[PDB]
Amino acid sequence: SKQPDKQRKSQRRAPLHERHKQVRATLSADLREEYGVRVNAGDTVEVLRGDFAGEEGEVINVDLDKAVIHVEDVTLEKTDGEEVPRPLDTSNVRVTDLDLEDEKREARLE
Amino acid sequence: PKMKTHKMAKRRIKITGTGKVMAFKSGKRHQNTGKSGDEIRGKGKGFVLAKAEWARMKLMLPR
Amino acid sequence: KTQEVVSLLEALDVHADIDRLFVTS
RNA sequence: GAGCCGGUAGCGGGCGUGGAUCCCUGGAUGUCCGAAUGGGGGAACCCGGCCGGCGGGAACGCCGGUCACCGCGCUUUUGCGCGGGGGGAACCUGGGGAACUGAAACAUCUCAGUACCCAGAGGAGAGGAAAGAGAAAUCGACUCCCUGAGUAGCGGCGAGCGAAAGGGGACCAGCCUAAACCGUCCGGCUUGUCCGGGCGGGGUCGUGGGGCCCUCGGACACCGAAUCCCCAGCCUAGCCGAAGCUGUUGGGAAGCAGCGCCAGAGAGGGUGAAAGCCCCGUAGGCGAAAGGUGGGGGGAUAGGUGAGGGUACCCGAGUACCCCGUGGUUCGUGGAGCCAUGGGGGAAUCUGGGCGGACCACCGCCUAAGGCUAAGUACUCCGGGUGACCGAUAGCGCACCAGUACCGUGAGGGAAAGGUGAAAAGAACCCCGGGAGGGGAGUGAAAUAGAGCCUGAAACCGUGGGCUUACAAGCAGUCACGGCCCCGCAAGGGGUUGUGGCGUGCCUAUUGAAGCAUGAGCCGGCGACUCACGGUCGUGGGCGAGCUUAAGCCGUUGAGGCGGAGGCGUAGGGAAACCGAGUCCGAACAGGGCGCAAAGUCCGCGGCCGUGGACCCGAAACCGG
RNA sequence: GGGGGAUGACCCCAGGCGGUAGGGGAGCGUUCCCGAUGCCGAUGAAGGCCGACCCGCGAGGCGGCUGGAGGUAAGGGAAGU
RNA sequence: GGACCCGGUGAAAUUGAACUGGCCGUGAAGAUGCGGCCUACCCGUGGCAGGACGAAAAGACCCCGUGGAGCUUUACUGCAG
């Protein structure tokens, strides 16, 4: 990991969880400030960019896989019709309501 | 890297600081030449100009 | 400390410092 | 650390924090080929002994396991138990080993001991404690880098080939056995005293070993391994990990503006258009294991050698030495040695025996004719780092269903072809139509971004328009004058031409060229005076005695700085002895070279000259497998 | 070449100037390395497409249309020009 | 039976470029393109061979490179036997 391309080499080829490494971030005031150690993943938040910028929503699906996730809110409808969840650019991602009602959620991040 | 007809460098050859070079007369003698005497008095040293450039050069360096 | 530089800094800054150029002895 | 059943996105179904996917390491399976090895064979198939369940044997009997090739030691007995062999890009030594081409032919020579083939060692082999080198009574392992030196020198003295000791540097490092002398024996002959092989003595480093007699003397000396954990390094994932938000032009902001923080980590990359502070498992910096491989380093293992004189003496080899015929060496037959050997003679055991280049005297060196020996140099398949290194005809030829498609019987050849987008949201539905494909709607910032769908130029084929065209010559055309047509650089120009006016295209090689001499059909991209070491003048400049190898150290950036063997100038003149601002010819003051300082030297950048495939492609041919 | 050049430049006249191998001097764009107290650009990097300002020139600048992301160096260096 | 007229398909070497006439003269000496002249409307299809020094192929005949390759003998040397 000392060159441009060795980034694709220990992130997605190595431990997929390394991609978890990607789900990385912070969120609201509470929690955050409070720290930032111990995540949740499929939590809630509210992006901060892209037309949808400054929006309200929640963490639907830990997609690490595709390299990002989905946010019920954030989405769109096809052209045939039916609606649908859009792709979640890892990038602009916000979480404040730190999913933690599940004791195991509060025993790791908040 | 370089050398030189080391030869000629051997036989006939060798310069003066002057930037010039000379080799022993070289009329006839030392082969056929019952010929004469005074002619003998015909072997000191002969300095040819112009060409003495290939020469010198080609030798260049040590001599 | 590299914040004692922020110091002996404010001592004498400018643009030439811009340049700068460390070096002890 | 919380998602997954690989690239498959799709249907149908499912495992999971009373630690799944996957990252590690050690496992057990490893069907058939391939050294193949049980036997045969046109590989990937077909055949055999021993054990084996016993197995459907419904009231009737099979696969599985197995096993075994052959050359190697030798507990020999009837031979039981260990090693090998096959690979492998490049690199290593041995075994064998060539023409081209240069010499402007070519027989000597060169390319070379190169290219190739063969065998085989290794992770490195090569080599390696000296019958060595040379001569200052000086040096000492081998190796490798610089230097010595393009010197001494080899030669149809032609083209060329072209050492070494010594000095500087990296490393260091030393040991064994036959080596019958002693004793031990075991086996023979046949009892003695012979040869024999296992045990020690010694088991030689720079001359000693034994055997005898008296002095001995009575603990720190580990190697190539052997050993223990040690920091075992790495082995992939180890993990923390400083600090901004609002406002805004925007389809998108991380931009434009306002205020805010970081900091040994402003290395870059991903983020809808350019962030230190949004993601980054990055540089800051500390982190990390039960298995696979070291030095460093600690210890005993330590294996192991380690002092005195004397005596008539016996103990590192079968061929040294010599004659002929080759080798290597700088040595091409030479005044020609050393070492290595193809044939034939066939010595010595310390006043022995080679050596210091024919030989000889004397001096000086060394002690062969067995063996092991890490480290210092070479090489990239592998993994990383870095780029005045490339960008899809460049780079490996091959950026991803390529050494594959495809021609070749074969050995072998050997291509082309990457790019939508922010993500599919990849175009439901309606239309002409057998469809493909075209018309709308919808995504959308834009689809003349639309599915081989970024940029998407030229050549070349179209569709309309201006001008122009039927008594006319030249690619060309360009100068004059005229009419139609447009004047976003208006009283000046655009475009097109009717006439007339003067006109032989374009490249190489050519005495000479339009050409009827050749070169080219058209467009786009590749495509040809380069680099290195020398030398050579010119110039930009640092000291005039000028200047640096190789290496040692220092190194986000990584910062150069020390290193004084050398080499060119400091006189030269001469074959030399040698003399020397003088010298060689000579016996003569007659000339040749030089003196007269004018002094360079290193470097940089250039016009050139030699070695180079070396301005670029071009053939018939020779030589290897 | 010569008469004074302040750095330009200006004046005289002498004085030519056709030129292949080929010799000397001076300039131009091409992809890169500087960022010698250098950074432009979503109201376009660049290439493209078209032109009656700047230069003897090889090129420049600059304005209109295109196209999706770069890269420019006022100056010296380098080269697969 | 092609060739010709129809419908369907649809190559190929060579070629700088071209709207390419005869004359008699010319030039490097056998010219549609240069001079003078005479005939001379614009295009085509079925043909006929003469000229475009037509196409094929960097002459095999030639000489030149102190090129190459094969056979020959009282060529030179050397090896096999």
mmCIF file of C-alpha atoms (C1' of nucleotides) in Angstrom, chain D residues 285-553:
data_model
loop_
_atom_site.group_PDB
_atom_site.id
_atom_site.type_symbol
_atom_site.label_atom_id
_atom_site.label_comp_id
_atom_site.label_asym_id
_atom_site.label_seq_id
_atom_site.Cartn_x
_atom_site.Cartn_y
_atom_site.Cartn_z
ATOM 1 C "C1'" G D 285 2.727 7.394 14.640
ATOM 2 C "C1'" C D 286 2.170 3.358 17.733
ATOM 3 C "C1'" G D 287 0.071 -1.244 16.743
ATOM 4 C "C1'" A D 288 -0.069 -6.752 16.201
ATOM 5 C "C1'" A D 289 -0.444 -13.577 16.890
ATOM 6 C "C1'" A D 290 -0.733 -19.856 18.623
ATOM 7 C "C1'" G D 291 2.134 -22.172 13.055
ATOM 8 C "C1'" G D 292 6.750 -21.127 8.198
ATOM 9 C "C1'" U D 293 12.813 -18.843 7.792
ATOM 10 C "C1'" G D 294 17.802 -16.016 9.440
ATOM 11 C "C1'" G D 295 21.726 -13.009 11.045
ATOM 12 C "C1'" G D 296 22.605 -10.303 15.209
ATOM 13 C "C1'" G D 297 23.732 -12.854 20.199
ATOM 14 C "C1'" G D 298 23.554 -15.122 25.117
ATOM 15 C "C1'" G D 299 25.188 -19.525 27.106
ATOM 16 C "C1'" A D 300 27.003 -24.195 27.711
ATOM 17 C "C1'" U D 301 26.793 -27.599 23.804
ATOM 18 C "C1'" A D 302 31.990 -26.860 21.751
ATOM 19 C "C1'" G D 303 33.798 -30.269 17.605
ATOM 20 C "C1'" G D 304 38.271 -28.916 18.465
ATOM 21 C "C1'" U D 305 43.386 -27.943 18.695
ATOM 22 C "C1'" G D 306 46.910 -25.390 22.273
ATOM 23 C "C1'" A D 307 54.625 -25.918 25.677
ATOM 24 C "C1'" G D 308 61.200 -28.351 26.153
ATOM 25 C "C1'" G D 309 65.398 -29.848 24.164
ATOM 26 C "C1'" G D 310 67.983 -34.607 21.730
ATOM 27 C "C1'" U D 311 68.899 -38.981 18.210
ATOM 28 C "C1'" A D 312 72.106 -42.692 13.065
ATOM 29 C "C1'" C D 313 66.139 -42.632 11.173
ATOM 30 C "C1'" C D 314 61.299 -44.335 8.831
ATOM 31 C "C1'" C D 315 56.035 -40.876 7.370
ATOM 32 C "C1'" G D 316 50.636 -36.612 1.449
ATOM 33 C "C1'" A D 317 50.349 -39.742 -3.166
ATOM 34 C "C1'" G D 318 50.373 -43.429 -9.221
ATOM 35 C "C1'" U D 319 54.290 -39.872 -13.770
ATOM 36 C "C1'" A D 320 58.139 -34.651 -11.045
ATOM 37 C "C1'" C D 321 61.465 -34.782 -14.613
ATOM 38 C "C1'" C D 322 62.745 -35.607 -19.891
ATOM 39 C "C1'" C D 323 61.752 -36.396 -25.579
ATOM 40 C "C1'" C D 324 57.737 -35.579 -29.320
ATOM 41 C "C1'" G D 325 52.536 -33.721 -30.301
ATOM 42 C "C1'" U D 326 48.563 -29.850 -28.837
ATOM 43 C "C1'" G D 327 46.316 -26.322 -24.685
ATOM 44 C "C1'" G D 328 45.872 -21.849 -21.788
ATOM 45 C "C1'" U D 329 48.759 -17.554 -21.076
ATOM 46 C "C1'" U D 330 49.879 -10.911 -23.830
ATOM 47 C "C1'" C D 331 53.345 -15.202 -26.595
ATOM 48 C "C1'" G D 332 50.633 -16.565 -33.595
ATOM 49 C "C1'" U D 333 56.567 -21.816 -33.666
ATOM 50 C "C1'" G D 334 59.460 -18.127 -31.796
ATOM 51 C "C1'" G D 335 66.201 -16.766 -27.754
ATOM 52 C "C1'" A D 336 60.205 -18.789 -25.387
ATOM 53 C "C1'" G D 337 59.294 -20.453 -19.497
ATOM 54 C "C1'" C D 338 55.676 -21.603 -15.742
ATOM 55 C "C1'" C D 339 51.126 -24.553 -14.985
ATOM 56 C "C1'" A D 340 47.820 -28.280 -17.702
ATOM 57 C "C1'" U D 341 48.389 -32.869 -20.474
ATOM 58 C "C1'" G D 342 48.044 -36.901 -26.015
ATOM 59 C "C1'" G D 343 52.259 -41.048 -26.519
ATOM 60 C "C1'" G D 344 57.439 -43.308 -24.424
ATOM 61 C "C1'" G D 345 60.954 -43.653 -21.077
ATOM 62 C "C1'" G D 346 59.665 -44.091 -15.407
ATOM 63 C "C1'" A D 347 63.792 -40.020 -9.779
ATOM 64 C "C1'" A D 348 64.596 -38.403 -5.039
ATOM 65 C "C1'" U D 349 61.778 -38.418 1.101
ATOM 66 C "C1'" C D 350 64.832 -32.106 4.276
ATOM 67 C "C1'" U D 351 72.173 -31.082 2.458
ATOM 68 C "C1'" G D 352 65.170 -34.076 -0.572
ATOM 69 C "C1'" G D 353 62.466 -31.911 -4.499
ATOM 70 C "C1'" G D 354 60.069 -27.343 -8.325
ATOM 71 C "C1'" C D 355 60.617 -22.390 -8.715
ATOM 72 C "C1'" G D 356 62.464 -16.612 -9.852
ATOM 73 C "C1'" G D 357 60.956 -17.183 -17.652
ATOM 74 C "C1'" A D 358 67.055 -21.174 -22.995
ATOM 75 C "C1'" C D 359 70.812 -22.522 -20.023
ATOM 76 C "C1'" C D 360 74.896 -22.324 -15.625
ATOM 77 C "C1'" A D 361 77.179 -20.741 -11.091
ATOM 78 C "C1'" C D 362 75.713 -18.316 -6.523
ATOM 79 C "C1'" C D 363 71.519 -16.024 -3.939
ATOM 80 C "C1'" G D 364 66.332 -15.611 -2.784
ATOM 81 C "C1'" C D 365 61.197 -18.144 -2.541
ATOM 82 C "C1'" C D 366 58.286 -22.411 -1.817
ATOM 83 C "C1'" U D 367 57.357 -27.201 0.096
ATOM 84 C "C1'" A D 368 53.288 -30.026 -4.468
ATOM 85 C "C1'" A D 369 51.601 -35.519 -7.379
ATOM 86 C "C1'" G D 370 44.119 -36.142 -1.811
ATOM 87 C "C1'" G D 371 40.043 -33.208 0.402
ATOM 88 C "C1'" C D 372 35.960 -29.316 2.962
ATOM 89 C "C1'" U D 373 35.517 -24.141 3.473
ATOM 90 C "C1'" A D 374 30.131 -19.493 4.772
ATOM 91 C "C1'" A D 375 31.234 -13.910 3.620
ATOM 92 C "C1'" G D 376 32.839 -9.877 -0.498
ATOM 93 C "C1'" U D 377 30.835 -10.192 -7.010
ATOM 94 C "C1'" A D 378 26.401 -12.418 -11.164
ATOM 95 C "C1'" C D 379 21.061 -13.282 -12.336
ATOM 96 C "C1'" U D 380 15.674 -11.802 -12.462
ATOM 97 C "C1'" C D 381 10.398 -16.237 -12.644
ATOM 98 C "C1'" C D 382 8.835 -14.096 -8.405
ATOM 99 C "C1'" G D 383 6.809 -9.321 -4.290
ATOM 100 C "C1'" G D 384 7.652 -4.201 -3.450
ATOM 101 C "C1'" G D 385 9.410 0.727 -4.414
ATOM 102 C "C1'" U D 386 10.524 4.606 -7.844
ATOM 103 C "C1'" G D 387 10.153 7.117 -13.074
ATOM 104 C "C1'" A D 388 12.767 14.683 -17.198
ATOM 105 C "C1'" C D 389 8.972 5.765 -19.063
ATOM 106 C "C1'" C D 390 4.628 5.051 -22.325
ATOM 107 C "C1'" G D 391 -0.664 5.896 -23.630
ATOM 108 C "C1'" A D 392 -3.900 2.436 -27.075
ATOM 109 C "C1'" U D 393 -0.465 1.253 -34.861
ATOM 110 C "C1'" A D 394 3.487 3.776 -28.074
ATOM 111 C "C1'" G D 395 4.602 -0.069 -24.138
ATOM 112 C "C1'" C D 396 5.797 -6.886 -23.258
ATOM 113 C "C1'" G D 397 3.656 -8.514 -29.437
ATOM 114 C "C1'" C D 398 -0.628 -9.682 -25.890
ATOM 115 C "C1'" A D 399 -4.789 -3.505 -20.316
ATOM 116 C "C1'" C D 400 -8.271 -8.711 -19.966
ATOM 117 C "C1'" C D 401 -13.987 -15.516 -22.293
ATOM 118 C "C1'" A D 402 -4.927 -13.930 -26.831
ATOM 119 C "C1'" G D 403 0.621 -17.057 -27.417
ATOM 120 C "C1'" U D 404 -6.096 -17.682 -28.366
ATOM 121 C "C1'" A D 405 -8.594 -16.743 -33.467
ATOM 122 C "C1'" C D 406 -5.923 -17.860 -38.103
ATOM 123 C "C1'" C D 407 -2.163 -20.040 -42.182
ATOM 124 C "C1'" G D 408 1.653 -24.320 -41.102
ATOM 125 C "C1'" U D 409 1.834 -31.992 -41.631
ATOM 126 C "C1'" G D 410 5.684 -30.159 -38.206
ATOM 127 C "C1'" A D 411 9.480 -27.393 -35.801
ATOM 128 C "C1'" G D 412 7.083 -22.560 -35.957
ATOM 129 C "C1'" G D 413 4.330 -18.114 -37.087
ATOM 130 C "C1'" G D 414 1.363 -15.295 -34.578
ATOM 131 C "C1'" A D 415 -3.043 -10.982 -34.918
ATOM 132 C "C1'" A D 416 -6.518 -7.493 -34.366
ATOM 133 C "C1'" A D 417 -9.993 -5.494 -30.788
ATOM 134 C "C1'" G D 418 -10.131 -0.656 -24.843
ATOM 135 C "C1'" G D 419 -13.205 4.078 -23.731
ATOM 136 C "C1'" U D 420 -21.878 5.734 -22.915
ATOM 137 C "C1'" G D 421 -23.085 7.760 -18.285
ATOM 138 C "C1'" A D 422 -23.003 10.494 -12.002
ATOM 139 C "C1'" A D 423 -25.457 6.100 -11.729
ATOM 140 C "C1'" A D 424 -28.484 2.793 -16.147
ATOM 141 C "C1'" A D 425 -32.349 5.699 -14.616
ATOM 142 C "C1'" G D 426 -30.554 1.145 -20.488
ATOM 143 C "C1'" A D 427 -35.712 3.297 -22.966
ATOM 144 C "C1'" A D 428 -42.568 0.489 -20.313
ATOM 145 C "C1'" C D 429 -46.597 2.491 -23.914
ATOM 146 C "C1'" C D 430 -48.520 4.255 -28.689
ATOM 147 C "C1'" C D 431 -47.182 4.415 -34.218
ATOM 148 C "C1'" C D 432 -45.423 2.235 -40.156
ATOM 149 C "C1'" G D 433 -43.341 -2.703 -40.527
ATOM 150 C "C1'" G D 434 -42.437 -9.616 -42.008
ATOM 151 C "C1'" G D 435 -38.586 -7.937 -38.964
ATOM 152 C "C1'" A D 436 -34.406 -4.819 -38.501
ATOM 153 C "C1'" G D 437 -35.050 -0.179 -38.289
ATOM 154 C "C1'" G D 438 -37.452 4.423 -38.323
ATOM 155 C "C1'" G D 439 -41.995 8.415 -35.435
ATOM 156 C "C1'" G D 440 -43.666 10.092 -30.799
ATOM 157 C "C1'" A D 441 -43.624 9.944 -25.092
ATOM 158 C "C1'" G D 442 -40.154 9.208 -20.626
ATOM 159 C "C1'" U D 443 -35.152 9.305 -18.028
ATOM 160 C "C1'" G D 444 -32.164 13.755 -18.854
ATOM 161 C "C1'" A D 445 -27.528 18.894 -17.536
ATOM 162 C "C1'" A D 446 -26.907 17.155 -23.272
ATOM 163 C "C1'" A D 447 -28.853 11.657 -26.349
ATOM 164 C "C1'" U D 448 -26.407 15.065 -33.776
ATOM 165 C "C1'" A D 449 -24.195 10.887 -24.798
ATOM 166 C "C1'" G D 450 -28.214 6.145 -27.178
ATOM 167 C "C1'" A D 451 -26.154 0.688 -26.815
ATOM 168 C "C1'" G D 452 -19.629 -1.194 -30.108
ATOM 169 C "C1'" C D 453 -23.491 4.243 -27.840
ATOM 170 C "C1'" C D 454 -16.587 9.995 -25.257
ATOM 171 C "C1'" U D 455 -13.470 13.086 -28.382
ATOM 172 C "C1'" G D 456 -15.505 11.159 -32.728
ATOM 173 C "C1'" A D 457 -10.723 15.138 -38.029
ATOM 174 C "C1'" A D 458 -9.343 13.695 -43.414
ATOM 175 C "C1'" A D 459 -10.169 10.605 -47.706
ATOM 176 C "C1'" C D 460 -14.708 9.188 -49.819
ATOM 177 C "C1'" C D 461 -20.445 8.753 -51.041
ATOM 178 C "C1'" G D 462 -24.925 11.924 -50.513
ATOM 179 C "C1'" U D 463 -29.261 16.077 -50.123
ATOM 180 C "C1'" G D 464 -30.340 21.607 -51.169
ATOM 181 C "C1'" G D 465 -28.483 26.490 -52.400
ATOM 182 C "C1'" G D 466 -25.109 30.664 -54.936
ATOM 183 C "C1'" C D 467 -22.291 31.176 -59.164
ATOM 184 C "C1'" U D 468 -21.007 28.711 -63.662
ATOM 185 C "C1'" U D 469 -21.489 25.449 -68.428
ATOM 186 C "C1'" A D 470 -22.443 23.221 -75.722
ATOM 187 C "C1'" C D 471 -17.728 26.962 -82.420
ATOM 188 C "C1'" A D 472 -14.030 24.895 -76.521
ATOM 189 C "C1'" A D 473 -7.316 23.346 -73.988
ATOM 190 C "C1'" G D 474 -5.029 22.363 -69.522
ATOM 191 C "C1'" C D 475 -3.238 19.583 -63.766
ATOM 192 C "C1'" A D 476 -2.116 24.322 -63.486
ATOM 193 C "C1'" G D 477 -3.018 28.585 -63.264
ATOM 194 C "C1'" U D 478 -1.874 33.350 -62.180
ATOM 195 C "C1'" C D 479 -2.019 39.166 -63.918
ATOM 196 C "C1'" A D 480 -6.215 42.501 -66.313
ATOM 197 C "C1'" C D 481 -11.281 43.659 -67.178
ATOM 198 C "C1'" G D 482 -16.455 42.737 -67.053
ATOM 199 C "C1'" G D 483 -21.778 40.619 -65.162
ATOM 200 C "C1'" C D 484 -24.480 37.925 -61.307
ATOM 201 C "C1'" C D 485 -24.554 36.795 -55.721
ATOM 202 C "C1'" C D 486 -23.516 38.273 -50.107
ATOM 203 C "C1'" C D 487 -21.732 43.215 -47.617
ATOM 204 C "C1'" G D 488 -21.229 40.813 -38.393
ATOM 205 C "C1'" C D 489 -14.659 44.146 -39.323
ATOM 206 C "C1'" A D 490 -20.218 48.809 -45.347
ATOM 207 C "C1'" A D 491 -18.290 53.627 -50.786
ATOM 208 C "C1'" G D 492 -13.878 48.080 -49.176
ATOM 209 C "C1'" G D 493 -13.964 43.400 -49.722
ATOM 210 C "C1'" G D 494 -16.154 38.155 -50.067
ATOM 211 C "C1'" G D 495 -17.399 33.842 -54.034
ATOM 212 C "C1'" U D 496 -17.981 32.413 -58.984
ATOM 213 C "C1'" U D 497 -15.777 32.949 -63.278
ATOM 214 C "C1'" G D 498 -16.606 35.421 -69.818
ATOM 215 C "C1'" U D 499 -12.741 36.881 -72.219
ATOM 216 C "C1'" G D 500 -7.930 37.634 -73.044
ATOM 217 C "C1'" G D 501 -2.455 38.036 -71.516
ATOM 218 C "C1'" C D 502 1.754 35.329 -70.219
ATOM 219 C "C1'" G D 503 2.732 29.992 -68.839
ATOM 220 C "C1'" U D 504 5.630 22.477 -69.607
ATOM 221 C "C1'" G D 505 3.261 18.990 -63.811
ATOM 222 C "C1'" C D 506 6.255 16.872 -58.591
ATOM 223 C "C1'" C D 507 9.861 14.109 -56.648
ATOM 224 C "C1'" U D 508 14.986 10.740 -56.585
ATOM 225 C "C1'" A D 509 19.397 9.648 -59.900
ATOM 226 C "C1'" U D 510 21.321 12.598 -63.755
ATOM 227 C "C1'" U D 511 26.358 16.111 -69.113
ATOM 228 C "C1'" G D 512 21.440 17.051 -69.494
ATOM 229 C "C1'" A D 513 14.747 16.086 -68.115
ATOM 230 C "C1'" A D 514 7.926 18.012 -69.501
ATOM 231 C "C1'" G D 515 8.877 14.158 -69.127
ATOM 232 C "C1'" C D 516 8.183 8.798 -72.760
ATOM 233 C "C1'" A D 517 13.458 7.457 -66.995
ATOM 234 C "C1'" U D 518 11.940 6.154 -62.261
ATOM 235 C "C1'" G D 519 9.034 7.330 -57.439
ATOM 236 C "C1'" A D 520 3.807 7.694 -56.111
ATOM 237 C "C1'" G D 521 -4.009 5.787 -57.040
ATOM 238 C "C1'" C D 522 -6.489 8.738 -52.269
ATOM 239 C "C1'" C D 523 -6.522 10.257 -47.198
ATOM 240 C "C1'" G D 524 -4.987 9.793 -41.919
ATOM 241 C "C1'" G D 525 -1.107 7.897 -38.104
ATOM 242 C "C1'" C D 526 4.336 4.995 -37.609
ATOM 243 C "C1'" G D 527 8.812 5.976 -40.447
ATOM 244 C "C1'" A D 528 15.026 7.171 -40.576
ATOM 245 C "C1'" C D 529 22.440 11.292 -38.461
ATOM 246 C "C1'" U D 530 20.708 8.779 -32.300
ATOM 247 C "C1'" C D 531 23.449 6.708 -27.254
ATOM 248 C "C1'" A D 532 27.787 5.006 -24.759
ATOM 249 C "C1'" C D 533 33.105 4.729 -23.666
ATOM 250 C "C1'" G D 534 37.392 6.806 -25.678
ATOM 251 C "C1'" G D 535 39.837 10.731 -28.649
ATOM 252 C "C1'" U D 536 39.397 15.396 -31.139
ATOM 253 C "C1'" C D 537 39.125 21.059 -31.931
ATOM 254 C "C1'" G D 538 35.825 25.102 -30.409
ATOM 255 C "C1'" U D 539 33.524 27.462 -26.737
ATOM 256 C "C1'" G D 540 31.056 28.665 -20.938
ATOM 257 C "C1'" G D 541 33.493 28.895 -16.959
ATOM 258 C "C1'" G D 542 36.406 27.036 -11.541
ATOM 259 C "C1'" C D 543 41.751 27.003 -9.533
ATOM 260 C "C1'" G D 544 47.295 27.399 -12.420
ATOM 261 C "C1'" A D 545 49.886 22.803 -10.492
ATOM 262 C "C1'" G D 546 44.825 21.869 -12.285
ATOM 263 C "C1'" C D 547 41.312 17.459 -11.492
ATOM 264 C "C1'" U D 548 38.554 12.902 -10.048
ATOM 265 C "C1'" U D 549 38.134 7.223 -9.657
ATOM 266 C "C1'" A D 550 35.979 2.729 -6.876
ATOM 267 C "C1'" A D 551 34.173 3.383 -1.787
ATOM 268 C "C1'" G D 552 33.266 4.613 3.341
ATOM 269 C "C1'" C D 553 29.560 7.659 5.864
#
